[PDB]
Amino acid sequence: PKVTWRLASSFPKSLDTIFGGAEVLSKMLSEATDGNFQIQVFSAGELVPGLQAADAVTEGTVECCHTVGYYYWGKDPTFALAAAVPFSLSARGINAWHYHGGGIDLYNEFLSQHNIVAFPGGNTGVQMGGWFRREINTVADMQGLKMRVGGFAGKVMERLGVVPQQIAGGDIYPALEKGTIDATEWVGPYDDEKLGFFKVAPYYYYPGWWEGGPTVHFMFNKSAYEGLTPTYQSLLRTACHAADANMLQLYDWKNPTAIKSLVAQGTQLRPFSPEILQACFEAANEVYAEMEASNPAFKKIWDSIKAFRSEHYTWAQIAEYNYDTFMMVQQNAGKL
Amino acid sequence: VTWRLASSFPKSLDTIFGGAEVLSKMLSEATDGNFQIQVFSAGELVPGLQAADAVTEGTVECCHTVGYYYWGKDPTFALAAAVPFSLSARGINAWHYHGGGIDLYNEFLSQHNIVAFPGGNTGVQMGGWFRREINTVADMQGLKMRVGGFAGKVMERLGVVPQQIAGGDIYPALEKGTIDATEWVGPYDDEKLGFFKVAPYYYYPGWWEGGPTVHFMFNKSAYEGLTPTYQSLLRTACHAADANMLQLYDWKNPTAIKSLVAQGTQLRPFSPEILQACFEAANEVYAEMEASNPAFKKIWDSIKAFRSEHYTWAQIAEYNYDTFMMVQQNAGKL
């Protein structure tokens, strides 16, 4: 049957892989229905501002959006849990929980009151730790750090004396160039290379512990979703599931070429030290303790994630870790 | 559209066999029953190991199988499924969907009347169940192991003597001491066989299968006779089902390994010496195949081109993040 919807993306077209997930979903649905199930994609600001995409869905302004749940953490930190919070699961672990651990239903139980039904719509994999003008090696090096970063990541780092900066995307490069900020988040090698941060902030840190496996949800107006035939509800879920895998796979394909290119252009890769990672982890757990004690919805979902998190990281160190470690050791020896 | 799908798998291998049921449900629901793929377990339509042969010959429209089952016909069949020391699941999927891998494999399969798309991944498989521990290459000399395919060919060069044993006859063989070890799959499936009762040393990793994909293979004429609409729907649903199986294993395996250890299973890593020896032996086998088989060389070279890039990048953000979480788990901090 003919369905004609609008999708408001939180993302600009220049974030091609993330924005592209909505295009992929739209194409999947159109093609599978000989053009009948139409979702017209719009990029950030075209219909509504990117950070208000979910609000538009709730209000019935548009039928759906493609967004990251953590954009709405200010309304309720529970929005962040199924997207990404610091020191959560990486992509395969979160996906196991989403699809087979009851995570999609748990998140939808929370979202019902907000007039939304959501399904995973991509994963970026572990993000990078950002672009730095000067090295940081110790916790003390973080004192008074001016970093363009926000949300959860920012809340955690504030416990360690960093002050998050609010700066428009296009204003970051000149701020780094002038020395007005010390560091910036962005995404990962494929997206970051285009911004040329390496020219003015050469140290590229990792891992972005605030986003170990962030899911980019498709969120649907609850009335609109419920009005679909069972056939289209099923197709929609199938297509979201495929699109979700597709984005991760695209990043997994593109990122290796991009990191090589960045290093070839003089980028200085640097791990966050064990001391820094341990401090950030401790700070994050302090924040979660407060939230769990004050917010029952948050506690329910986070306890569910944590239950699987310990099991996942027990198993992952057996076959997966040992296989991959062996391959990496071969690679470092020039043997691949 | 009413099609029959011959599975290579028995229903008791529920998560692998189940992939076909998942695809069938996705297609039926999305079309209100108009695109019906009827799923048959191993031996119901044709013998399980002849599933792709039946597709090639057009006796059935499609199958759900593992490419390396047909490595006897041409070792190229195995490459997009799993060969030793290839990519793990995210790496191979990157190559499949965005590295031209699906197209490269289909270019090979065209002569065999098949169009194939990934239909699941199991993630890294285990190294098998052993009556006695092994630590060195010397320890492998004369080892009677139930294993075949590439893995058997490689280990044979190191002195193991591969055994050809039906799934159902493995437990009794271990019980009676007629064999020393067996491979099977991983914790979820392996637990159901109760190998910990007779051969409790559970080795890892199964380096022969880092990220095995289980393909749907469709008769090319059958596929080309679908409307472009159903062709596209079929690709979308395969892509979803492929993710679904990996996600099921990633969910189930943590529970199974805990249960196995609780019941006395002794986890043991293959030593650096053993792994390196297997890696060198595998490269020797590849060098032989590449020199004699242009089709094999073309696809393997493509996988290897990405393999080195992948293992450069994966060791940065992904490995550092995950290893930090593992350390925290081990410290009781999660």
Residue numbers in the entry:
A (entry chain B): 30 to 365
B (entry chain A): 32 to 365
Sentences from the paper on this structure:
The structure of the selenomethionine-labeled protein in its native form was first solved by the MAD method and then refined to 2.0 Å resolution with an R-factor of 17.9% (Rfree = 20.5%). This does not exclude the possibility that a more stable closed form might exist in solution, but it makes this hypothesis less likely. Two kinds of conformational changes occur upon complex formation. First, there is a 14° rigid body rotation of domain II (rotation was calculated using the DYNDOM program). Since the residues responsible for the binding of the substrate belong almost exclusively to domain II, the proximity of the two domains in the apo state may facilitate the substrate-induced closing.
In Rhodobacter sphaeroides, TakP (previously named SmoM) is an ESR from a TRAP transporter and binds α-keto acids in vitro. In this paper, we present the high resolution structures of TakP in its unliganded form and complexed with sodium-pyruvate. This study reveals a key role for an ion in the attachment mode of the substrate, as well as an unexpected dimerization largely mediated by a helix swapping.
